Structures are given as structure tokens and as C-alpha cells.
């Protein structure tokens, strides 16, 4: 009789079948292009005979059921919770299956996990057989049904001008089931108006859309203006299922299968230095079988007040030789996948949400990895008292400031690139000798790996 | 293929295969007096099958529980998996000659709205996903153009 | 200068080197899988010293030429010929070559001989050690060539449902030899396009397939449709090589070998009566040495319209102990040998052509040898005036009808089976004597095999 409606139809993600309470379910921020259910195997079973009078016959069987089909879009809107203080996507199971299987837990360090912030998710964790278990529930009007087991297949997030940010995710069920009973009440689970006002308070617009990109090689930093981007976290997930003639049967359990992180980024081609025909014939002049690049794309722009962004970083990533694409003015693509350090060492990429980025911020992000955490920016070494100069025979102990003053890693390396006249050791204690009568120069670069510089040239003489 | 939907009138279609098209320059039979005349035409056009009107009758054979369900739009085709036979010789072109009737297929798809009313879609929906049975024996009578008491037009 | 395809060649089949008229040769109608040849052996003499410093050098001798292969394979199309109105392949010799060793008669009796109702091979008289003797002509495009002396090997006939009736030969030669000059003009010998209409009427299609099936020591009649098959008439013959160091040498005549008429049939297991289930069960529980069954496959189907048909028939055959193939719906082989009552006796098989074949000629075929003579189909006995009983000490000479009225064995035998109260011989006169009070019974039966019944219940009393 009553018609159900997909307009009214609310989704709900939970990490257990009873007991739901607010920290294991959530109302999450769908669009109308929502679509599940749940097929099934079938076999027909034919007869071909040669005799006067052929059998025309056809019996069919059910063999199995398919795995459970669903997949939404939802908004990219980090925001901070008046509960905890800290920077918060409002879909943070869903990255945190997506990223590592252990128990959610927002204070570790691997997986999904905030901060105050922002909200940083690393893959660290992920070398699982089996990734955080969820349990997708639908409420379409007042008629209940959830997917058993969900898992996180892959997370598609788009990223182009004139398009407002978003992600799409789809995954698998071992199996849909409706239910009659309500699980639980959705008026207190489901968000209240007051953090609908905060959530949107924030809102990512991909238009401002800056690039970072970067080779280990050679450290030759591009500006490439982005017509439009995507990139995709990818589980290769299968659910395995037994295979009986008497019965059918249903899906149990899967293996994650191989991790992929890829992505395609379009952008016009620019004449001007460090631009994208820079990039195209350097990459298509050193071909060369393995690419280790910085790739740091940031959704929403960067600025001095604090903006809502999102980031990814891909450490050393590989980039595919670009085939410019021909339209009405040139605008090439760029593929790249990023690779580990090690095949299970992890690390292939951390990404970064929330409302509250300044350019330090996303920067001290990108290069140490924590929103929260600062980095060198500048470095003069400093002389041991002001010197300018040195003597043959005398020692010399560099000293060095490093700025902010807040920074967590402050410590740098010594090194003698320019002239061989002195040597410097670990702690910084330059010496000279006879037949030293070059100028010769000193530099120094912090482990964390800004880009710093650290540079003086000092006139050492021949000495009175 | 017969199509059986809403905002659809009721219509077949046929495909078939021949041994070989032949163009011919004389008239086998006059085609006025073959040809259906115009009082037949009339007689055949008094009766029209509109799909608007469709009414199933679903009913399985291991529970006898009769559901009723609005249909949407739906399509029941008869197969006969005819393959002809040619042979194969290098010197001169060939012709099929013949042919074997494979095997005997009758499906359909029938698609309506969900129903939270008692002997629904839903109702059926949860019957089958409840008990997955790998083999089902119902009773299905799909009737294009509606039931009345007064005589209509049906398929 | 030219290439040559595969796809412009012609075959001819002559039992003269010259003289080539349309009596000696005609074109056989041969397919994509034709392929002919000739191999040479070879040798290779290496020095195998031990020491250091050895001798290593080899040297090759070419020294003996194997017999040429080839073969072909040919659609049955039995038709019949405008000039003599008799039923008869376009392969003939080929049969022919195959049956017997004899020079071609197709008026007579043996081996591949016609009628005016179908076209008969036998292997009655096949005990030579060189069967009739073919030249097989091949024309590929412009250039000539043919091989020596050649002998049918075998003929393979698969009976492969959804496929046309094909019968693929082999064979060997004594040399095949290269021709520059035109043996014959293949326009004239070549079939016209008359023929070819007559032939292409007549297509034998392996669907239609019924094959008959009796156990000759229960009289039990199976109903078994099949689903695939294949039987072969097989020579067996050897080429015989001489061995010359000095020269390289080519085969110098041949023997024939054992000739084997086997069989391999595949057919679903059905519970219905006289099925294959039966049958198998039957051959299973007896485990018998020897078997006594009568097979005749039917190519092409039975009808009472016209209809073309290739026919196998073997009398006295031995049937395999029977094996379940399991398929997606189950299955059996029923693999037979078509044995001969005597070895020195032949009659193992015989086979009929004929693009009309009404179900009668078939049977008459099958229960006589022949499809032209006519077989008997019923009986009922009748006595001497009418007489529907009979008395103590009275005669009794009955008589007998026979239906067709043109059967060639119009007799039949004379035998008493329930009931001892009378006595028969060989014309009929049945003979009883006092104290038979008891009711007696007389049998008929004919003397061509048709297996036709010819009962009566006389009710003979004491008297009056």
C-alpha cells in the first residue's frame, strides 16, 4: 500500500548489531544517487538428443548468491565536534575501514585518527586479510533493512572545477537482509540541527584547486594549474563462497587483495618555467623505469586565514609518461600510482580534513605529516661568535638557528660542498690546516626534510 | 518478444530466419482478394489490447499464498534456439540446408513497485530471500488487458 | 611464378595410369582438412671418442623414404545418376577400394555394388593381401601431381549431432610423384553442375539419428537415443620398405592387416523400459565373454516420406561391458565390434546408400541384406479349411498367409510350443493321437529373419 520513497530514505553505518549508540552509529551525508541490492547465480540445465523425438527441455537451478551490491556519495565536510574539540570528518568509520581493520580508535596514530588539528588518515596499518567490518543500514521511510559485513571496496573521489567536492563509496555485503523491528531510534542517532550548522559551516570547493608536485631526483618543483583531477583508494576486495550442488550459499568472509592508490590529474599545458611542458619533456626525455615524486594535491586552495581543504600526499609516487591530449587549447594528463618504500611497509599516502588550514599548517602536513606538528622553514648557520672568516690551523664550531622556534625537529647535518680546504664533523667543528688557502663554504639541512638551506661563505685565508 | 508495459498498447514481435531470400518477378496470388478486407479490418480493430490494464496472478505451489501485485511494466519471450546447418565446400558457395530446433525457453521479467501492504511485492520480495530454495514451482498467470465482468479484450 | 592455396584443389580417384575416362575417374568432393605428403628417414653418424682432443663431427645419410600419407574428408551423398538410374555415391570406388579386392562390379554381388533402389557395400570378399588398387590425382591450382599405388587404410565415419553426415578417409602410397603435363581435362571429368543440383538434394544430417539395438540371445529390442558416436572400417595395412645401404629406397607393395569394424556410441541414462538404463544394467549383471548383438545405425533418420539415409548393419556384434559417464546430466558409452560368425566367413557388417528410403526398405535392408528385396512383416497361421479345433486321432495340415504378398522368402518353419498333444513336421501335417485332452498351441516363424510371429490356439478336445 504505502509507496516507499528513495528521497526519504536514510543510511546509517554502525560497527555492531546491538547496543547502537552514538560512537558506532552515525547518519552520513548521501546523495540521491544511492542504489543497493543483493542477485543471485543460476544455472540451466539443457538436453540434446538425436533420436526421432528430441527432448526440448530446460531445468533451471539456483546455485549461489552474489555478493550484496551498495555504493552512495557523500560530502567532503570536515568539521571539529563541540564534544572533543577536534577536527572531525562526519564519515569517519568509513575511512577508518577504508584505511586500517583495527578497532576505531580517533587518538592512535595508524588508520583514521584526529587531531586538534586536523583529521589525518594513514594506510599504515592496512596489511590486513580483513579490514574494518561495518554494517550498512538502510531506513527507507519506516521499513528497516541493513547489509551484513559491509567492507570498504573502493572510495572514488573526484576532483575537478565547477564541481563541488565530493567522494563516492562503494562496497560489498555478505548479505542484504530487511528488517521488521527497528534497531534502534534514528531521531538521536541521526544528526541534530546544530551540527548540521557546523558541518556545513564548512564546505570544500574544488575550483581552488593548487598542485604540488615534486621530484626526489632532481627536486624540480612544478606550478601546474589543474583543469581537473581524480583519484581513487582501491582494496581489491573478493568475498569468497563455498560452492554446494544440495544447497545454495552465501559469501563468508574475503581477502583484501592488492592496495592501489591511483589517480589522473588534467591541466593545460603552460610555456612558462616550471610549467606543465616543462614537466612533459623532462619526463618524456628521461625515460626511465621507476618515478619517486612528491605529489601533494590540495582540494579547496591554500590561504592565510584558515579555509576548508583537503589534502593528499603521496610520498614517492610514480608518475606515467603523459600523453598530451589534443582539444580546443592543448591540456595534457598526468597518471600516477604511488608506490611504498617498501610492498609492506605501508606508508603509500596520509590524507588531511578540516575546515581550519593555513599554509604553515598544510605545509608542516606535507612535509612531517601531522597538521599539528611544525617544521624548519628557514635556516642561517650561525657562526661561533660572529665570525666571518677563518685561519690555517684553527678550529671553528658551527652553531646554527632554526625557525619557528616551535619546531619539533630542530636538528641539522654538516656538510662542505663548495672548496676543499677544511673538513666539518657531526657536531659542526670546522677545521683547517696548512695549505688551506681557498675560500670554501658550509651548509646545513634538517632531517625532516622541508627543503631548507642553511648557507654562509666564510673567506678562510692564509691566515696572519 | 512479446512486450507487455504500461503507456505500451499491446503488440508482438517476431524474428525468423530463412534458408534463402529468392526476388521474384511474377505474382505468385493476387493480393486484393488474399488481403484481408475491409469488413474484417473492421471486425479486427473492435478489438484492441491495451497493457494498461495488467493484472497478475502469482501463486506458489509449496504455500498457496497468492500475493497481489500491481505490475509496472513487463516482457515474456518464447525462444526456440534454431540454428540452420551449412556445409563447408571450398569449390562452390553453399546454402543452409535445414535445421534443429534446440532448446525450449519461455522467460519473462516482470517489474512492479514494492508494496508494504499483507501479500505484497515485499512480502514476496521477503518470502524468497527468506527461503532460498534452488528450485521454485509457482503458478504464474500474467493477463494483458484486464479482467471483467463485461466481455473485454485480454492476452 | 604463383602461390598456390589450398582452397583450388582438386582430387580424382583413378584405377588407371592412363586411358582416364569418366569410368576410371571422377572428382571427389574433399574439404578443408585434405592433406597429403611424404616423409623421408635419415640417419646421423657421430664418432664418440673418450680422450682429450676428440673427434667431434657428424654426418648425415639419407636412407629409406616412408609411404605417402594422405586423406580427406567427404559429405555422404547418396543420389542417383541420370545415365544408369541406380542409387549410387559419387565415392564409389573409394567403397569400393575399401570393401574388397576385387575389380569393380557394380552389377555384381560383393563389395561396392548398386541398384535401383540403393547403393550396398559388403566386405564378403575382402581376403586379399592387396584390395583393389586406386591412384589418387591431386590438382592444386595449375601444377599436376599424384600418388602411386594407393590403398583405402580406413574410413572414419562421426556421427556428431548438429553436424552433416561426413566420412573422413586415410590412406598410403607407394610414392607421391610431381606431374608437369595434364593427366586428364579435370572440366570434363569433374562433376557438372547437373550432378551437383541431383547431390546437393540429398544431405545427410547427423541429427536425425535412430539406431537399433537388439540382444540376440534374450530378443529384447532397446530404445536408445543417442548423443554421439563414431565407427570406423579399419584395414590395417602396412607398407613394406626394403633396406639398401647403398641407395635410398621407396615402399614396394603392402599387406593388408586385420579389418576391424568398431564403434563407440554415447547416450543418457533414461529409466524408461527397454532404455539405456536397461541396457547397461543388463550387460552389467550378465558378465558374459561373448556377446550377440544385432546394431544398425541409422544415418539420416527413418520416415515413411522419402528421405536420405546412411545405414550400418552389424549382425552378429560384441558389445563392451558399458561405463556411466558423468556429465552434467548422465551419461553412458555403449562400444561395440562388429564380429564375423567365421573369421574366414567376412559378412562382419554391411552398409546401405540411398536418398529413398521409406521405413520398409530400411527394415528389408536391415532382416534381408538387401533394400530391394522385400521382407515379412506379419503372419497369421491358418488351417486346413477353416478349422477352428480338432478331435483325437485327426490331422491337422495347416496352411499359412503372409504379408507383403511380394517377400522374397515367402516359407516359414513349423514348430509346437505350450501344450503336448500334437505332433508337426516339416510341410505342416499336424498329427495327434488318443488321450489328448489338453489344449495345444503351433508356431511360424520365417526363414529370412524378420522375426515375424505366426500363432494359433487350437483347442483340441477328447471328442464326441
Redesign the interface.
Known amino acids: ?4 520513497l528513495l528521497r526519504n530514505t536514510r543510511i546509517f553505518v554502525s560497527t555492531v548489531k546491538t547496543g547502537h549508540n552514538k560512537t558506532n552509529t552515525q547518519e552520513i551525508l548521501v546523495q540521491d544517487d544511492i542504489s543497493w541490492g ?1 542477485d543471485s547465480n543460476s544455472t540451466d ?14 531445468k533451471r ?3 549461489s ?1 552474489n555478493a550484496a551490491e551498495w555504493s552512495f556519495s557523500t560530502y567532503i565536510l570536515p568539521y571539529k565536534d563541540k564534544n572533543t574539540s577536534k577536527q572531525i570528518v562526519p564519515d569517519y568509520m568509513l575511512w577508518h575501514a577504508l584505511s586500517s581493520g583495527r578497532a576505531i580508535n580517533l587518538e592512535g596514530t595508524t588508520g583514521a585518527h584526529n587531531n586538534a588539528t586536523n583529521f589525518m588518515v594513514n594506510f599504515k596499518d592496512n596489511s590486513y586479510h580483513e579490514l574494518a567490518m561495518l554494517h550498512i543500514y538502510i531506513l527507507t521511510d519506516k ?1 528497516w533493512s541493513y547489509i551484513d559485513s559491509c567492507q570498504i571496496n573502493q572510495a572514488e573521489v573526484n576532483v575537478d572545477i565547477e564541481d563541488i567536492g565530493r567522494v563516492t563509496w562503494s562496497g560489498n555485503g555478505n548479505q ?1 537482509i ?1 528488517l521488521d523491528e527497528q534497531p534502534f531510534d534514528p531521531d538521536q542517532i541521526g544528526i541534530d540541527d546544530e551540527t548540521y550548522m557546523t558541518i556545513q559551516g564548512s564546505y570544500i570547493k574544488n575550483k581552488l584547486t593548487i598542485l604540488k608536485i615534486k621530484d626526489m631526483d632532481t627536486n624540480k618543483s612544478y606550478d601546474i594549474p589543474i583543469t581537473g583531477g581524480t583519484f581513487t583508494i582501491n582494496n581489491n576486495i573478493t568475498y569468497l563462497t563455498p560452492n554446494v550442488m ?3 550459499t552465501i559469501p563468508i568472509g574475503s581477502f583484501t587483495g592488492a592496495f592501489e592508490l591511483t589517480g589522473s590529474l588534467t591541466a593545460y599545458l603552460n610555456d612558462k618555467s616550471l610549467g606543465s611542458m616543462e614537466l612533459y619533456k623532462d619526463l618524456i626525455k628521461t625515460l626511465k623505469v621507476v618515478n619517486r615524486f612528491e605529489i601533494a594535491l590540495v582540494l579547496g586552495g591554500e590561504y592565510d586565514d584558515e579555509r576548508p581543504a583537503a589534502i593528499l600526499v603521496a610520498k614517492q609516487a610514480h608518475v606515467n609518461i603523459p600523453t598530451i591530449e589534443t582539444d580546443d587549447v592543448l591540456g595534457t594528463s598526468v597518471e600516477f600510482k604511488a608506490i611504498p618504500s617498501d610492498l609492506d611497509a605501508g606508508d603509500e599516502g596520509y590524507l588531511g580534513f578540516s575546515s581550519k588550514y593555513t599554509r604553515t599548517t598544510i605545509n608542516n602536513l606535507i612535509v612531517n605529516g601531522d597538521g599539528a606538528t611544525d617544521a624548519v622553514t628557514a635556516i642561517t648557520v650561525k657562526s661561533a661568535g660572529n665570525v666571518t672568516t677563518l685561519n690555517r690551523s684553527a678550529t671553528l664550531q658551527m652553531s646554527v638557528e632554526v625557525t619557528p622556534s616551535s619546531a619539533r625537529n630542530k636538528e641539522v647535518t654538516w656538510a662542505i660542498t663548495a672548496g676543499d680546504a677544511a673538513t666539518i664533523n657531526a657536531t659542526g667543528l670546522l677545521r683547517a690546516d696548512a695549505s688551506k688557502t681557498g675560500a670554501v663554504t658550509v651548509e646545513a639541512t634538517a632531517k625532516d626534510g622541508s627543503g631548507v638551506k642553511g648557507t654562509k661563505v666564510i673567506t678562510v685565508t692564509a691566515g696572519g
Chains 1, 3 share one sequence.
Open positions: 500500500m504505502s509507496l516507499q543483493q540445465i539443457t538436453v540434446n538428443e538425436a533420436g526421432p523425438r528430441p527432448t526440448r527441455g530446460s537451478f539456483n546455485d548468491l521499513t542484504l530487511p544440495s544447497r545454495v
